[PDB]
From Swiss-Prot, chain A:
InterPro entries (alphabetical): AAA+_ATPase (IPR003593), AAA_ATPase_CDC48 (IPR005938), AAA_ATPase_domain (IPR050168), AAA_lid_3 (IPR041569), Asp_de-COase-like_dom_sf (IPR009010), ATPase_AAA_core (IPR003959), ATPase_AAA_CS (IPR003960), Cdc48_dom2 (IPR004201)
Originating organism: Homo sapiens (Human)
Protein role: Necessary for the fragmentation of Golgi stacks during mitosis and for their reassembly after mitosis. Involved in the formation of the transitional endoplasmic reticulum (tER). The transfer of membranes from the endoplasmic reticulum to the Golgi apparatus occurs via 50-70 nm transition vesicles which derive from part-rough, part-smooth transitional elements of the endoplasmic reticulum (tER). Vesicle budding from the tER is an ATP-dependent process.
Post-translation changes: Phosphorylated by tyrosine kinases in response to T-cell antigen receptor activation. Phosphorylated in mitotic cells.
Phenotype upon changing residue 177 to W: In IBMPFD1; increased ATPase activity; impaired autophagic function
Protein's name according to its UniProt entry: Transitional endoplasmic reticulum ATPase
Family label: Belongs to the AAA ATPase family.
Effect upon mutating residue 348 to T: In IBMPFD1; uncertain significance
Oligomeric and partner information: Homohexamer. Forms a ring-shaped particle of 12.5 nm diameter, that displays 6-fold radial symmetry. Part of a ternary complex containing STX5A, NSFL1C and VCP. NSFL1C forms a homotrimer that binds to one end of a VCP homohexamer. The complex binds to membranes enriched in phosphatidylethanolamine-containing lipids and promotes Golgi membrane fusion. Binds to a heterodimer of NPLOC4 and UFD1, binding to this heterodimer inhibits Golgi-membrane fusion. Interaction with VCIP135 leads to dissociation of the complex via ATP hydrolysis by VCP.
Main location: cytoplasm
Cystines in this chain: none
Swiss-Prot record, chain C:
Coiled-coil residue windows: none
Domain description: The PIM (PUB-interaction motif) motif mediates interaction with the PUB domain of RNF31.
UniProt source species: Homo sapiens (Human)
Impact noted for substituting residue 118 to H: In IBMPFD1; uncertain significance
Transmembrane intervals: none
Protein name: Transitional endoplasmic reticulum ATPase
Subcellular location: Cytoplasm, Cytosol; Endoplasmic reticulum; Nucleus; Cytoplasm, Stress granule
Disulfide bonds: none
Post-translational modification N6,N6,N6-trimethyllysine, affected residues: 46
Residues of the full protein shown: 270 to 403 of 806
Pathological condition linked to this protein in its record: Inclusion body myopathy with early-onset Paget disease with or without frontotemporal dementia 1: An autosomal dominant disease characterized by disabling muscle weakness clinically resembling to limb girdle muscular dystrophy, osteolytic bone lesions consistent with Paget disease, and premature frontotemporal dementia. Clinical features show incomplete penetrance.
Record-stated family: Belongs to the AAA ATPase family.
Native organism taxonomy: Eukaryota, Metazoa, Chordata, Craniata, Vertebrata
Modification after translation (UniProt): Phosphorylated by tyrosine kinases in response to T-cell antigen receptor activation. Phosphorylated in mitotic cells.
Binding-site list for ATP 1: 79, 115
Phenotype upon changing residue 36 to Q: Defect in ubiquitin-dependent protein degradation by the proteasome
Length: 741, 256, 134
């Protein structure tokens, strides 16, 4: 459909003018004196008369700067053009000088800036248009806010004037730039797409949903940890469509008198009912509606019941939806989680590593960076930070870059000259300082992500790879062949082996290969539940796994409570978990005999995969894998290092590639001592080049670091796992038989 | 399983929305006003329902469920003495309540199975419930001992009067020796004597360590009969082997 | 002051808080100070009534209702950061938290050097020696 075209630069000086192509005249059939609307970004538009010229390309429009800025469009972006037959004359558009380049003129200036500029054109002016008029070294732009016709106006010279108000400053622009777009929010792209799917199609198409007969949602819960911009996302969804926002604050409707807050709530819901298809928003719901235990009075119960009655008193034709914002769904009064009030509950959780790059890409926009900075490197660290924490990081790094420039920002110059105001760029060690010296992370709970380890990170174990592929990949990649002859999928394996042979590093590999999420709870996180008798606190970590559908929750040392319950609390939950969800439960252990046999009943945790000690190819693989970061000399052999270490566990030879690093860092520190402690340190025969005595780990560092090696696992305890492998009957008995012929 | 009527309404609306969402090739941005083509020419298909069931809709149900089972007597062949005994202890007090009143023999109120682990105990207990057209609730081990691990011992009265509400039921414990690893046996014991006999609810309990059980459960009046479930014999083996291959198409020359 | 805006009548302390924040907004780049925050905003467990919750929410709303152009900053003063209602330690209200802890040995010399200013000492006294103890 030939409506949308890219915009490029123009030469002409006339305003509210759009350039059309002369080969395409007969499809639109509008002549020169016709007005058109141009769709722009962040739901702000402008109006123009057309010009039919040859200086524009076939799909590219040549337009001036101020209407490119009124659409907020730049070079490369694609805009739409549509005819608008509602052209009419109007009365008293409210012009206003919005710049500081007025030069102090007041009164009636509009006889030389307005009346000679608009005539012989039928000039179309939309509300909010930022057209300028230049006269007498005064380029004053009049952004109109009140147009009595709708939506645009044609200015007549007989229009009576009304200009008693005062010209104002750039503050009115700051309340229009926060009509933000989809690109103004990052880190939650999947959840943004899901909530856009949930919300946008009822709102832009109210008739089709009533036409089929489906129900639009009535209440969505935006729960997540505080500070991740749970109010900016609602503003973006509402302003990216033709909605109308209404922000009910949390404690603002608590700081009223008694018997008056409900009047505010009724006024707000009436304003929602009266206006367009709109969306209200309630931030911090748990301050006006906590759990029932945190209700010692009764007026809060009156407010809560008022909220419940006004929530259920809405109609599906009113086209209003309610978004709340908590931090955890167990911190709400559960009387409003029933059907009809608040059912669908999304989780804008913690942003991940590559989800953290755009959230500071959007913050480093107005700050001049140098060429040495690397946002990917800082993105690799700063685990646990949230968006507000990253904004604080950016501001503190800029302040440190200011604070190193106190040599020019002096006390003698109280008024700061315009030199350092635009000639200061932040460098990388400032960011490293601001990360290191400050900013403690406000995160301690679990994190959902896809791992980035690969299958060749631990070579070998092809039978275990085949088994895990058969138990994880095939129930999700081919769910129909499992339905042809009705074989139900299993719900979890149990690893067991010697301590530290890459158990977690094997469990993350299948999660990465399936593109599946991976949570992980450990031993000390487990038994601190039943040491303080919080046994009924695994339901939330299971329904969090329910929320992320393709997950594999991984216990680790679940025999840690078998030193002297919560095994029963997982046991009553695993049977209640359905099988159509494809969540798997892999548990690891080191003492497989001391485990409870009720965990081994068929249905709960059936397969028993044995992880052996690492073999030769796995050893050289992990040895190469640990030396990704460190530059190693090219003559340093590793195959000779492979077959020398025979009984070494996977956690023992990962130690010698840090002991060798420590033994080389000692010598690289020590070599710098004598070079600065040169006696008669003269400029003659000075090493202007860096000598770099240890540029990389050499051979004798490994030859000396190997001398402190020690196998952790003995022979007496690998026989324990061989004997437990013999306690499984291990396909022994009758043996081979054949069917008759 | 576990869905309620509102959940099924939500399932229907989401399946219709998924059928809309696959038709975005015609529902375009160039046609803001949607033509009358797709408004009445879009039918939902089965994998949309399978998507809407799989991808979403967590069930809002965790408590017990009352129903009649659908297993049949030939699902586990053999054990004709056990079938005769269970018929004598379940069917005759409800199918013929007058002959039990001619010469005043009172009905018994429950058996105690015991045998090796996993020989079709629950799959035998549901068969008489299906045959009598009787309801069948079932609580298990881990559902049991989590009462006394958090000292909610007085929380079997509701699961008993729920069984009182459904009159022809057979409530089935399973591994009631699970608390005999180190109470609530007394809480069932004070309730079983208070339960009348004109209601025809029966209490069948299963176990695997019959010696470690409390002997007070074996007093006459409470739980008297002791039926022994042996290992499956040949005819039962071929019966269960044929029974597990209902869904899977098997080649006709595969002998069983 | 802390308990001075607690010793008012009901429904009148919030008028004082609004008057104070308005006076901060009207004047120059300025700084207000709230001493003893844990007497007007303790933890949630130490809140048996509801008027204190109205005062706390009034403090939260007036705190978040400021603009970055108003040039007013707020300093509070507690003894331990776990003795505050944690609903006002979120981002935008109270984030940066410094610790003017116990003065040390040589940090104790100037604190009595500033106190022995108007007192005539003899020549036998040794502020370093008393600074070593105490």
């Amino acid at each position: 459909r030939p409506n949308r075209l890219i915009v490029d630069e123009a030469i002409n000086e006339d305003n509210s003018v759009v350039s059309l192509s002369q080969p395409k005249m007969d499809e639109l059939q509008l002549f020169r004196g016709d007005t058109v609307l141009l769709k722009g970004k962040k739901r702000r538009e402008a109006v123009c008369i057309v010009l039919s010229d040859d200086t524009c390309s076939d799909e590219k429009i040549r337009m001036n700067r101020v209407v490119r800025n009124n659409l907020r469009v730049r070079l490369g972006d694609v805009i739409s053009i549509q005819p608008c037959p509602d052209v009419k004359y109007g009365k008293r558009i409210h012009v206003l000088p919005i710049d500081d380049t007025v030069e102090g003129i007041t009164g009636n200036l509009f006889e030389v800036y307005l009346k000679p500029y608009f005539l012989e054109a039928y000039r179309p002016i939309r509300k909010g248009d930022i057209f300028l008029v230049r006269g007498g070294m005064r380029a004053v732009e009049f952004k109109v806010v009140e147009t009595d016709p709708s939506p645009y106006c044609i200015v007549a010279p007989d229009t009576v004037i009304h200009c008693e108000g005062e010209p104002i400053k750039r503050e009115d622009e700051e309340e229009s730039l926060n009509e933000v777009g989809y690109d103004d929010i990052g880190g939650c792209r999947k959840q943004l797409a899901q909530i856009k799917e949930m919300v946008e199609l009822p709102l832009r198409h109210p008739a089709l949903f009533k036409a089929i007969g489906v129900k639009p949602p009535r209440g969505i819960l935006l729960y997540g940890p505080p500070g991740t911009g749970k109010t900016l996302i609602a503003r973006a969804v509402a302003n990216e469509t033709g909605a109308f926002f209404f922000l009910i604050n949390g404690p603002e409707i608590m700081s009223k008198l008694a018997g008056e807050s409900e009047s505010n709530l009724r006024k707000a819901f009436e304003e929602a009912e009266k206006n367009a298809p709109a969306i209200i928003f309630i931030d911090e719901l748990d301050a006006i509606a906590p759990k029932r235990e945190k209700t010692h009075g009764e007026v809060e119960r009156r407010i809560v019941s008022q909220l419940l009655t006004l929530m259920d008193g809405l109609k599906q034709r009113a086209h209003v939806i309610v978004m709340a914002a908590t931090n955890r769904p167990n911190s709400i009064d559960p009387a409003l989680r029933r059907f009809g009030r608040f059912d669908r509950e999304v989780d804008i959780g913690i942003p991940d590593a590559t989800g953290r790059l755009e959230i500071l890409q959007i913050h480093t926009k107005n700050m001049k960076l140098a060429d040495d900075v690397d946002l990917e490197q800082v993105a690799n660290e700063t685990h646990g930070h949230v968006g507000a924490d990253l904004a604080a990081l950016c501001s503190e790094a800029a302040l440190q870059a200011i604070r190193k420039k106190m040599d020019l920002i002096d006390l003698e110059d109280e008024t700061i000259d315009a030199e350092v105001m635009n000639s200061l760029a932040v460098t990388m060690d400032d960011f490293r300082w601001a990360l290191s010296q400050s900013n403690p992370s406000a995160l301690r709970e679990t994190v959902v992500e896809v791992p980035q380890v690969t299958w060749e990170d631990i070579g070998g174990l092809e039978d275990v790879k085949r088994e895990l592929q058969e138990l994880v990949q095939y129930p999700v990649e081919h769910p129909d062949k499992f339905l042809k002859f009705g074989m139900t999928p299993s719900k979890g394996v149990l690893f067991y082996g010697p301590p530290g042979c890459g158990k977690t590093l094997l469990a993350k590999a299948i999660a990465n290969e399936c593109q599946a999420n991976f949570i992980s709870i450990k031993g000390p996180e487990l038994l601190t539940m039943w040491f303080g008798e919080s046994e009924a606190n695994v339901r939330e970590i299971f329904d969090k796994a329910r929320q992320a559908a393709p997950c594999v929750l991984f216990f680790d040392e679940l025999d840690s409570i078998a030193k002297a319950r919560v095994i029963n609390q997982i046991l009553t939950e695993m049977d209640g978990m359905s099988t159509k969800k494809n969540v798997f439960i892999i548990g690891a252990t080191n003492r497989p005999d001391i485990i409870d046999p009720a965990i081994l009943r068929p249905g709960r945790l059936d397969q028993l995969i044995y992880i052996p000690l690492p073999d030769e190819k796995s050893r050289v693989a992990i040895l190469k894998a640990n030396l990704r970061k460190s530059p190693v000399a090219k003559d340093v052999d590793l195959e000779f290092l492979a077959k020398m270490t025979n009984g070494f566990s996977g956690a023992d030879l990962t130690e010698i590639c840090q002991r060798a690093c420590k033994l080389a860092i000692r010598e690289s520190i020590e070599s710098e001592i004598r070079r600065e402690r040169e006696r008669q340190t003269n400029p003659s025969a000075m090493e202007v080049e860096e000598d770099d005595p240890v540029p990389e780990i050499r051979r004798d560092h490994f030859e000396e670091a190997m001398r402190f090696a020690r196998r952790s696992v003995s022979d007496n305890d690998i026989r324990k796992y061989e004997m437990f492998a013999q306690t499984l009957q291990q396909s022994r008995g009758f043996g081979d038989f054949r069917f008759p012929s």
